[PDB]
Amino acid sequence: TTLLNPYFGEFGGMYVPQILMPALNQLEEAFVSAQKDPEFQAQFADLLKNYAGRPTALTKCQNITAGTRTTLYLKREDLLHGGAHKTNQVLGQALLAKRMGKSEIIAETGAGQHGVASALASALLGLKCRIYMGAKDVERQSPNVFRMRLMGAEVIPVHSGSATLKDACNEALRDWSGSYETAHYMLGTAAGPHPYPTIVREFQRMIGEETKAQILDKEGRLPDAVIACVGGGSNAIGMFADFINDTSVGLIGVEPGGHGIETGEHGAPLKHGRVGIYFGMKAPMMQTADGQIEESYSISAGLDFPSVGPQHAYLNSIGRADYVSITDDEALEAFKTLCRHEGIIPALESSHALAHALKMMREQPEKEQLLVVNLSGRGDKDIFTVHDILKAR
Amino acid sequence: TTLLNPYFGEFGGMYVPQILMPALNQLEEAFVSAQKDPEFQAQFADLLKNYAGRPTALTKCQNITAGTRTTLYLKREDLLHGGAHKTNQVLGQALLAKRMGKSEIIAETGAGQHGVASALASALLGLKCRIYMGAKDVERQSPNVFRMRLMGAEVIPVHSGSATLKDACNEALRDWSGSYETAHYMLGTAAGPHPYPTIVREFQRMIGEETKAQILDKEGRLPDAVIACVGGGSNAIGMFADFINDTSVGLIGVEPGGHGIETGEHGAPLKHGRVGIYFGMKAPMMQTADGQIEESYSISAGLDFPSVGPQHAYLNSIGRADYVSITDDEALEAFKTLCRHEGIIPALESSHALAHALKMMREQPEKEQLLVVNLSGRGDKDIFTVHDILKAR
Amino acid sequence: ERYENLFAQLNDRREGAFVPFVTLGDPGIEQSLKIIDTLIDAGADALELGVPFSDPLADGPTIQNANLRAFAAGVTPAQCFEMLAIIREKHPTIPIGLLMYANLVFNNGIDAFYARCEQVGVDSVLVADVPVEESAPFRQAALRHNIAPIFICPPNADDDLLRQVASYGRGYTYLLSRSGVTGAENRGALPLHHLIEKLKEYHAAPALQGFGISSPEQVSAAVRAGAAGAISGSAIVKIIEKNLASPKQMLAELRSFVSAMKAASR
Amino acid sequence: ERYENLFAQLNDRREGAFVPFVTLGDPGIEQSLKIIDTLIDAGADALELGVPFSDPLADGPTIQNANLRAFAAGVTPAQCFEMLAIIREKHPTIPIGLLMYANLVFNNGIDAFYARCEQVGVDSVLVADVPVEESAPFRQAALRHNIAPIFICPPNADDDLLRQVASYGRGYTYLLSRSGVTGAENRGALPLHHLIEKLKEYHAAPALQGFGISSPEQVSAAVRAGAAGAISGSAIVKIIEKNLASPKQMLAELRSFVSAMKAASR
Ligand SMILES: Cc1ncc(COP(=O)(O)O)c(C/N=C(\CN2CCc3ccccc32)C(=O)O)c1O
Ligand SMILES: Cc1ncc(COP(=O)(O)O)c(C/N=C(\CN2CCc3ccccc32)C(=O)O)c1O
Ligand SMILES: O=P(O)(O)OC[C@H](O)[C@H](O)N1CCc2ccccc21
Ligand SMILES: O=P(O)(O)OC[C@H](O)[C@H](O)N1CCc2ccccc21
Ligand SMILES: [Cs+]
Numbered sequence A, B: 001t002t003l004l005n006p007y008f009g010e011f012g013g014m015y016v017p018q019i020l021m022p023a024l025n026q027l028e029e030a031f032v033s034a035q036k037d038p039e040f041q042a043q044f045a046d047l048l049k050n051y052a053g054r055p056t057a058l059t060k061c062q063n064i065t066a067g068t069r070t071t072l073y074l075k076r077e078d079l080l081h082g083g084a085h086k087t088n089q090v091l092g093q094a095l096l097a098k099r100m101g102k103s104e105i106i107a108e109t110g111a112g113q114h115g116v117a118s119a120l121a122s123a124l125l126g127l128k129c130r131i132y133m134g135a136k137d138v139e140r141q142s143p144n145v146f147r148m149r150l151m152g153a154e155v156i157p158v159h160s161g162s163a164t165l166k167d168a169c170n171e172a173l174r175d176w177s178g179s180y181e182t183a184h185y186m187l188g189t190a191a192g193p194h195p196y197p198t199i200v201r202e203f204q205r206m207i208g209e210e211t212k213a214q215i216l217d218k219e220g221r222l223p224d225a226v227i228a229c230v231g232g233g234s235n236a237i238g239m240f241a242d243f244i245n246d247t248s249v250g251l252i253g254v255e256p257g258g259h260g261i262e263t264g265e266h267g268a269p270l271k272h273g274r275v276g277i278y279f280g281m282k283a284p285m286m287q288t289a290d291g292q293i294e295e296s297y298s299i300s301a302g303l304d305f306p307s308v309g310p311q312h313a314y315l316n317s318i319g320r321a322d323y324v325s326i327t328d329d330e331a332l333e334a335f336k337t338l339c340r341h342e343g344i345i346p347a348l349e350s351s352h353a354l355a356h357a358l359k360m361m362r363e364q365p366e367k368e369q370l371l372v373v374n375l376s377g378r379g380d381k382d383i384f385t386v387h388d389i390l391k392a393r
Numbered sequence C, D: 001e002r003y004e005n006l007f008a009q010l011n012d013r014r015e016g017a018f019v020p021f022v023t024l025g026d027p028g029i030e031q032s033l034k035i036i037d038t039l040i041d042a043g044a045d046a047l048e049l050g051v052p053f054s055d056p057l058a059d060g061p062t063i064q065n066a067n068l069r070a071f072a073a074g075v076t077p078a079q080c081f082e083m084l085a086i087i088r089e090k091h092p093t094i095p096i097g098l099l100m101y102a103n104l105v106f107n108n109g110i111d112a113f114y115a116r117c118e119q120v121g122v123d124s125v126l127v128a129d130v131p132v133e134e135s136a137p138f139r140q141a142a143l144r145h146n147i148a149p150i151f152i153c154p155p156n157a158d159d160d161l162l163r164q165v166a167s168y169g170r171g172y173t174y175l176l177s178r179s180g181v182t183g184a185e186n187r188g189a190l191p192l193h194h195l196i197e198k199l200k201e202y203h204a205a206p207a208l209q210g211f212g213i214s215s216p217e218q219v220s221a222a223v224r225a226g227a228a229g230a231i232s233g234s235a236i237v238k239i240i241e242k243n244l245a246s247p248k249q250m251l252a253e254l255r256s257f258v259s260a261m262k263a264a265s266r
């Protein structure tokens, strides 16, 4: 029994060991209560505005779309304190955690942006933060490991499995299984067991709400399409949510194509996986024929995850939202293009969203279209990784 | 002959080879003209708002001042696109450069934040950017060298002299001497020959104007004091400017004390130097008895400069503004404190401003005071430098 | 009706059950089959057997490494069912319980899974990541194919959960000794007396305590608390891990442990 | 009145001036004094001498390194004035011009600086980073102590500047061959005929071209353009740099160069 619907059509649920069900029910209750609480909302609002830096800018590109009839705006979540959209929802979850009398936070991280957000929120609001991060990501997203540790968070390298996000997720959940009484699990994406996909969306929805208000002011109408990368679905659903009932507005999610879908080394379960049960949810999974969970791959640590949030699987199934993939090389080109022609360094995750938007424009340059890319974060963390790759060429 | 006063009392002037005087006069003319131009102002405004991310937040600290009667706000220039206040004025100067038909930019950098700002503005607005940076700073502020180069700027290591900001300044000016017809010298601070100290202040004054409006809304009154670090004086004068005629408002500048003023290894010419002529201006200089320019030292590359802007020397001489120093170790402690108790990673430059504000509070904890620290930038660039130091301990 | 018959025989003998767990195919198919025969011979009242899964979320490193050893041996779910059939052929009456993760059950159809279970002579299935709230198609398909669906009664169980576990489950109730994940080092200390009596009140299948049981004293304590027996997993698996290079000494040490654990159940 | 006498003697002889520059104390005080005597002996009409400064903003690497060599030798402004006095003692009539940066002049008082200049027998001072706009206390103190204040006429000079340089300057006008900083490799190509005639019209002190003059052809061209002569700095200093280990060959190569450069001035 739950207060809210755990499912999005077939997808979602609460597939956790029985031991964690009361934790999840307590969290859902706290959330429903907080959402109705004007004091919680004012405090959340205050942190978002005066601490995080909201509203973020909506930037019109005026170089990269030259010679085409595409008008492109970037929603500047890269400008948010911490350097990614991740900060929005961790601030809400941290308030919920305190509201439930918890003094410790458990988080997983891949890009290290959620980690950094979990650490900064915990420093601010007086929580003891421990962070699980795959050994591979500790290395390829190193700047964020320094940032996290400087802010007093414990960072725990995970060497198991693919040594990436999936494996960090494993350890975080295993930990929480034994610590839920004292620790709140600050899940970093719109995935996992109910109520997380719902909570993460509601604590990210200001992205799309601001975008709507901003684009109306600048353009006098809604976007033709909003475009966002999909790691587990938080930034995309944050962008999409307020636009779902606006049927003219295309909703486009971009999964990591990795080295190529045909290689199997990708992170695109929504379009190239198969429904399964894992990480607390029934959702599209990369899995073997036997039902073992496949390891994913992406150049982008924040997208390198073999599953995806249930509301996206849902929104796709009914054809409300459309999902595509962009490869490493496509994402890199878009990374370079933004750097050199708009003076903005995007996260390699965000670069996937931009790459597809650039494809939309390039494929049909005389098609009149007003596009918004959610620039989920900045690429300071990717600096060395990108350098090492380009040098190797 | 000039349109505007080149001097602040005894300080300022235009001490350049005769060859560069027409460049400076052309620049002053372009500036006076642009300032009266509603189209220039609207475009500048547009870039600041929709591209840079202004207004920046004014964040109330609610941990670090616990147990004291100090209320501390941070003006969040660390949230600005690029990651420092530097971005404000480079966007104005870049517009001026175009307005003067220039297609190339020359800039010096120490922290690499002005460099990054000059590179990003040049990418955006279609200028060819070359950047002079001392070899020492290339190393201790490496993240910014990557950032600059990714954005298509040429970065030129300077090995001459102290291999820091001073020496980068030398090379930039020497270059401009031979390229002024095609290249605009985007000076990075409120120093150098007229009209730069005046232009940089006017293109940074929104910091103090926003701060004023923000503090009035939150507190119903003006600050007791605004506090800012002084590398060459841009962020501080940006903060100070709108508060100069508010005589109740204390204006406090913080020079790098380095290893200790008594060591001679510091960057505090305003309080511990001697008036001289160099870098196009008559200003406080670190100089030998013979009148040779001394090399400065600071843990902070962005403050490691043996001189200071003329308006600060002026504002000090008349006792409008007060200047102090903070050492490396003081700045580091403040760096750690903000990281771990407010969840904000400041630049080591900014940390000097914060350190003094923390001293104001700690020295007299029962003194009721409302303080604003200009948090000029974020400390992503200092991450490894700070780590390497703390590890060594 | 192997669980019903066992608990009837054990109560008749005023005795608790000892249930060892192993991962099927750890460290290889042949040695694992030998391991299982040794577990029975040493006095196992029932067996709990794990199908190697890629991401065992309810498991600490000991069993995590049991899954990996099996995978290193190339062990698939399909080869596990061949083993089970072979095990059932040799031992007609011993209850066999499976420890599953949901995806392995759901993968090629929940009904298809339980039908195969029955086909090979499995008696019960525990799905670690399927709480009572999500169990409907799982427990229905189980019952359709004469398999007992197993449910965990956690230490933090409220009354409504207790009554759900009592009604939904069959064969045995899994009484969880503590929060956390599997592990012989982490021992459950919290008294379970309150839960056992409530489960007996609601006529739940006989309770077996599991998680952190690695010593005979914990088996006896479990029995004296009113439980129908005790389950040891990680403790068993640690002996496999420790003796990988000494296959004969492995079975020797396993026999000793099971025999000691079973003795304490009396 | 050494400049007045020189230009009178040169015009009488239908001849242009050759003015070599060196940094005082490069590579050491002794060798530098020898260098200067060799420059004169080989036919220098006047001398331009630099006081080692920490940050020579109008100088390319060649002279940058001349300043550094001097500093490596421990050369101070005070030791430079000892040299000048010694140089003037030996050569009573040769005009001596100083190349200064502002801070060295301003340091212990502008008046004090020029008074010392006079005391040692210096004839002119060029302050590289003091444009006509900032020159008032500099040119006043110069004139007070019978020193010629020197001003640069750049290629981008307008009429108002020309008239300012003509009125404010004395001894000689510094005619800048090109924008940029000092350097023998970077040669000025832009015609200066327009500036020379305007300076003559406004009765400016005789013009000497400087910056990038490193060959006799450039000296002659300068003279034929109507200039009173030519200044070579970096070219001279490069011979010092090249022959640091061969002190005798240095003076030999210097004599050859100056002699060749002076010949072309006729
Ligand atoms: C800048 C940036 N942009 C996009 C994403 C992708 O995540 P979405 O949730 O928006 O789809 C990231 C992701 N970064 C991280 C990985 N997150 C946190 C936990 C998690 C589980 C499963 C999938 C994705 C995530 C991270 O920073 O930890 C990003 O940084
Ligand atoms: C984040 C940050 N905060 C303060 C300062 C100090 O400069 P102010 O001009 O605000 O006093 C910096 C400085 N960073 C740089 C050095 N700048 C640019 C050119 C220059 C000449 C002389 C003195 C200071 C400077 C830089 O990023 O290049 C900073 O980054
Ligand atoms: O391994 P220990 O002794 O802690 O007991 C648990 C045991 O492993 C268990 O019976 N079985 C095996 C793996 C697993 C996962 C969830 C629930 C039960 C089990
Ligand atoms: O060195 P070159 O031949 O380019 O000519 C310039 C010469 O160096 C000059 O006369 N003198 C020495 C250094 C300096 C700096 C500014 C103006 C004049 C000089
Ligand atoms: Cs903002």
Ligand SMILES: [Cs+]
Pocket: A065, A066, A067, A068, A069, A070, A071
């Ligand atoms: Cs366009």
Ligand SMILES: [Cs+]
Pocket: A230, A231, A232, A255, A256, A267, A268, A269, A303, A304, A305, A306, A307, A308
């Ligand atoms: Cs994914």
Ligand SMILES: [Cs+]
Pocket: B065, B066, B067, B068, B069, B070, B071
């Ligand atoms: Cs306070």
Ligand SMILES: [Cs+]
Pocket: B230, B231, B232, B255, B256, B267, B268, B269, B303, B304, B305, B306, B307, B308
């Ligand atoms: Cs300074």
